[PDB]
Scaffold this motif. Structure first.
Motif, PDB file in Angstrom:
ATOM      1  N   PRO A  87       0.820  -1.214   0.000  1.00  9.34           N
ATOM      2  CA  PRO A  87       0.000   0.000   0.000  1.00  9.34           C
ATOM      3  C   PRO A  87       0.853   1.264   0.000  1.00  9.34           C
ATOM      4  CG  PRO A  87      -0.701  -1.557   1.696  1.00  9.34           C
ATOM      5  CD  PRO A  87       0.682  -1.941   1.271  1.00  9.34           C
ATOM      6  N   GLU A  88       0.391   2.300  -0.696  1.00  9.67           N
ATOM      7  CA  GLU A  88       1.076   3.590  -0.716  1.00  9.67           C
ATOM      8  C   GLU A  88       0.191   4.492   0.135  1.00  9.67           C
ATOM      9  OE1 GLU A  88       2.294   5.258  -4.546  1.00  9.67           O
ATOM     10  OE2 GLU A  88       4.136   5.101  -3.360  1.00  9.67           O
ATOM     11  N   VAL A  89       0.767   5.083   1.173  1.00 12.92           N
ATOM     12  CA  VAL A  89       0.014   5.943   2.082  1.00 12.92           C
ATOM     13  C   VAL A  89       0.421   7.412   1.962  1.00 12.92           C
ATOM     14  CG1 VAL A  89      -0.706   6.238   4.464  1.00 12.92           C
ATOM     15  CG2 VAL A  89       0.012   3.979   3.684  1.00 12.92           C
ATOM     16  N   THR A  90      -0.574   8.295   1.890  1.00 10.88           N
ATOM     17  CA  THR A  90      -0.315   9.724   1.792  1.00 10.88           C
ATOM     18  C   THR A  90      -1.283  10.490   2.688  1.00 10.88           C
ATOM     19  OG1 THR A  90       0.433   9.454  -0.496  1.00 10.88           O
ATOM     20  CG2 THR A  90      -0.067  11.669   0.234  1.00 10.88           C
ATOM     21  N   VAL A  91      -0.728  11.369   3.521  1.00 11.92           N
ATOM     22  CA  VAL A  91      -1.522  12.165   4.446  1.00 11.92           C
ATOM     23  C   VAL A  91      -1.439  13.642   4.107  1.00 11.92           C
ATOM     24  CG1 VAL A  91      -1.748  12.932   6.826  1.00 11.92           C
ATOM     25  CG2 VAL A  91      -1.371  10.534   6.320  1.00 11.92           C
ATOM     26  N   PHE A  92      -2.592  14.304   4.147  1.00 12.37           N
ATOM     27  CA  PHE A  92      -2.666  15.727   3.833  1.00 12.37           C
ATOM     28  C   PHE A  92      -3.939  16.369   4.387  1.00 12.37           C
ATOM     29  CE2 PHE A  92      -4.657  13.406   0.380  1.00 12.37           C
ATOM     30  CZ  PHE A  92      -5.830  14.114   0.169  1.00 12.37           C
ATOM     31  N   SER A  93      -3.875  17.679   4.557  1.00 15.13           N
ATOM     32  CA  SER A  93      -4.976  18.461   5.100  1.00 15.13           C
ATOM     33  C   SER A  93      -6.050  18.751   4.053  1.00 15.13           C
ATOM     34  CB  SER A  93      -4.408  19.776   5.642  1.00 15.13           C
ATOM     35  OG  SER A  93      -5.428  20.707   5.900  1.00 15.13           O
ATOM     36  N   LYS A  94      -7.305  18.854   4.492  1.00 14.45           N
ATOM     37  CA  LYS A  94      -8.406  19.170   3.581  1.00 14.45           C
ATOM     38  C   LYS A  94      -8.467  20.679   3.319  1.00 14.45           C
ATOM     39  CE  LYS A  94     -13.531  19.220   3.330  1.00 14.45           C
ATOM     40  NZ  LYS A  94     -13.737  18.902   1.886  1.00 14.45           N
ATOM     41  N   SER A  95      -8.123  21.466   4.331  1.00 15.49           N
ATOM     42  CA  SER A  95      -8.169  22.923   4.222  1.00 15.49           C
ATOM     43  C   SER A  95      -6.874  23.537   4.728  1.00 15.49           C
ATOM     44  CB  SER A  95      -9.323  23.478   5.068  1.00 15.49           C
ATOM     45  OG  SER A  95     -10.505  22.708   4.897  1.00 15.49           O
ATOM     46  N   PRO A  96      -6.545  24.755   4.269  1.00 17.36           N
ATOM     47  CA  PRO A  96      -5.311  25.374   4.750  1.00 17.36           C
ATOM     48  C   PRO A  96      -5.313  25.267   6.275  1.00 17.36           C
ATOM     49  CG  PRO A  96      -6.121  26.621   2.954  1.00 17.36           C
ATOM     50  CD  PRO A  96      -7.228  25.649   3.321  1.00 17.36           C
ATOM     51  N   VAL A  97      -4.168  24.951   6.862  1.00 16.62           N
ATOM     52  CA  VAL A  97      -4.108  24.805   8.308  1.00 16.62           C
ATOM     53  C   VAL A  97      -3.888  26.110   9.059  1.00 16.62           C
ATOM     54  CG1 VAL A  97      -2.863  23.762  10.231  1.00 16.62           C
ATOM     55  CG2 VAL A  97      -3.351  22.417   8.173  1.00 16.62           C
ATOM     56  N   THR A  98      -4.866  26.482   9.877  1.00 15.37           N
ATOM     57  CA  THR A  98      -4.791  27.692  10.682  1.00 15.37           C
ATOM     58  C   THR A  98      -5.133  27.290  12.111  1.00 15.37           C
ATOM     59  OG1 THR A  98      -7.124  28.335  10.523  1.00 15.37           O
ATOM     60  CG2 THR A  98      -5.669  28.926   8.700  1.00 15.37           C
ATOM     61  N   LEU A  99      -4.176  27.481  13.009  1.00 13.18           N
ATOM     62  CA  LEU A  99      -4.349  27.118  14.404  1.00 13.18           C
ATOM     63  C   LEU A  99      -5.658  27.584  15.027  1.00 13.18           C
ATOM     64  CD1 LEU A  99      -0.724  27.615  15.753  1.00 13.18           C
ATOM     65  CD2 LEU A  99      -1.874  25.492  15.053  1.00 13.18           C
ATOM     66  N   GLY A 100      -6.317  26.666  15.726  1.00 11.74           N
ATOM     67  CA  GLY A 100      -7.565  26.980  16.388  1.00 11.74           C
ATOM     68  C   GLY A 100      -8.777  26.806  15.504  1.00 11.74           C
ATOM     69  N   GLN A 101      -8.553  26.646  14.199  1.00 13.20           N
ATOM     70  CA  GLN A 101      -9.651  26.504  13.243  1.00 13.20           C
ATOM     71  C   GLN A 101      -9.917  25.058  12.835  1.00 13.20           C
ATOM     72  OE1 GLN A 101     -10.074  26.893   8.722  1.00 13.20           O
ATOM     73  NE2 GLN A 101      -9.777  28.899   9.386  1.00 13.20           N
TER      74      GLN A 101
END
Ligand SMILES: *[C@@H]1O[C@H](CO)[C@@H](O)[C@H](O)[C@H]1NC(C)=O
Lengths: 181, 190, 14
Positions: A87-101
């Motif tokens: 398996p090839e695994v890839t992790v990423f955010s759905k939305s720009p990362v802004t602390l507290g949001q």
């Protein structure tokens, strides 16, 4: 080279379990899957549950023929068993990362085969069950699958993550780390 | 590791230009090998490997099955397309656009501005980088279209640049969900 | 008005 590709019948049935899957796809996304045990169609969008309907019983009947076919082909192939893939695994955010949001982490497990996998999340080394979710097995032209897992989360400087993937095609559990850089 | 015997059946429809050109293809798979199939362009079942002759032969010998299959191009493909037309094909989700600096880790001795276009659908999309009054053609690098799986896409476009007082950058995004393009601006030094 | 589907053909059982 088609403008649109649809699978009005992605039928799967495994001896392991045994287990199966029935779903429809359009342009690579899951329109719905049929809970085989509950015999209930589960659409993937409010828009779909509102305007379209599919009889779950049809999924069950097809899956039954697949079982009929599998047993027959197991014999014809002298019981040739499936080969495990890495398996090839890839992790990423759905939305720009802004602390507290509030956000959502996305863990994509590609080139899966056979379709048996364990995808769980870790928060600062601890197992995380809440806010976790996942797609069904999505098809691939090469006949393998890919599945996507979700973890809703509150971006924090004091919190990091790992997508834990378990598959017989891996010498040991795979860990893909991720943190708000 | 247990042994697994997997079976797969895929009923697929290929659409080009509305329903001008429609192609139907059913695929029977054992583990990962498509051993038999039916493609509407030919019209008869085919053993794709030596594992399929018993199947193709069985199905081709039955008149109603061949006809019924051939008819699925209409009862299934063209049929569902109609349902797809007033749902999926008209679904529109506007992208939210954001611009943020490279951070660190060195973008290659050359700073970076990241224009992230998120949560949009359909896939068709156009993103453009501007530096004041001119469009940036060089130093622009994009990630492939990214599929979140929730019926939304995402894409990232970085621009190699050197922060200089006065300069102004904007990211122009064109998508079928908006009549006007989305324009986000980032001002160097401030 | 309702979704249609392909019917997987069944292999001949002996
Ligand atoms: C299975 O065994 C039969 C008889 O021994 C043989 O004819 C056939 O070629 C074999 N097929 C495979 C996939 O091993």
């Amino acid at each position: 080279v088609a403008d649109h590709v649809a699978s009005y019948g992605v039928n799967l049935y495994q001896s392991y379990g045994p287990s199966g899957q029935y779903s429809h796809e359009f342009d690579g996304d899951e329109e719905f899957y049929v809970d085989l045990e509950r015999k209930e169609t589960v659409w993937q969008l409010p828009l779909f549950r509102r305007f379209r309907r599919f009889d779950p019983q049809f999924a069950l009947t097809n899956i039954a023929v697949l079982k009929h076919n599998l047993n027959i082909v197991i014999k014809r192939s002298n019981s040739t068993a499936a080969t495990n893939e890495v398996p090839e695994v890839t992790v990423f955010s759905k939305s720009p990362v802004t602390l507290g949001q509030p956000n959502t982490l996305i863990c994509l497990v590609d080139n899966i085969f056979p379709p048996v996998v364990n995808i769980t999340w870790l928060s600062n080394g601890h197992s995380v069950t809440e806010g976790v979710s996942e797609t069904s097995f999505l098809s691939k032209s090469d006949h393998s699958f890919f599945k996507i897992s979700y973890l809703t989360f509150l971006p924090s400087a004091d919190e990091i993550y790992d997508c834990k993937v378990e598959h017989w095609g891996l010498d040991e559990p795979l860990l893909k780390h991720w943190e708000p850089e | 590791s247990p042994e697994d015997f997997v079976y797969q059946f895929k009923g697929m429809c290929y659409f080009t230009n509305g329903t001008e050109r429609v192609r139907l293809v059913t695929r029977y798979i054992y583990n990962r090998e498509e051993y038999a199939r039916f493609d509407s362009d030919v019209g008869v079942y085919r053993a794709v490997t030596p594992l399929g002759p018993p199947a193709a032969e069985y199905w081709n010998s039955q008149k109603e099955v061949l006809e019924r299959t051939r008819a699925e191009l209409d009862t299934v493909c063209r049929h569902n397309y109609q349902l797809e037309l007033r749902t999926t094909l008209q679904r529109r989700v506007e992208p939210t656009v954001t611009i943020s600096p490279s951070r660190t880790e060195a973008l290659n001795h050359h700073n970076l501005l990241v224009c992230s276009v998120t949560d949009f659908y359909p896939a068709q999309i156009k993103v453009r980088w501007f530096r004041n009054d001119q469009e940036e053609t060089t130093g622009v690098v994009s990630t492939p279209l990214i599929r979140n799986g929730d019926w939304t896409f995402q894409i990232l476009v970085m621009l190699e640049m050197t922060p200089q007082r006065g300069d102004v950058y904007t990211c122009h995004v064109e998508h079928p969900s908006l009549q006007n393009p989305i324009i986000v601006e980032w001002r160097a030094q401030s | 008005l309702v979704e249609a589907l392909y019917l997987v053909c069944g292999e001949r059982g002996g």
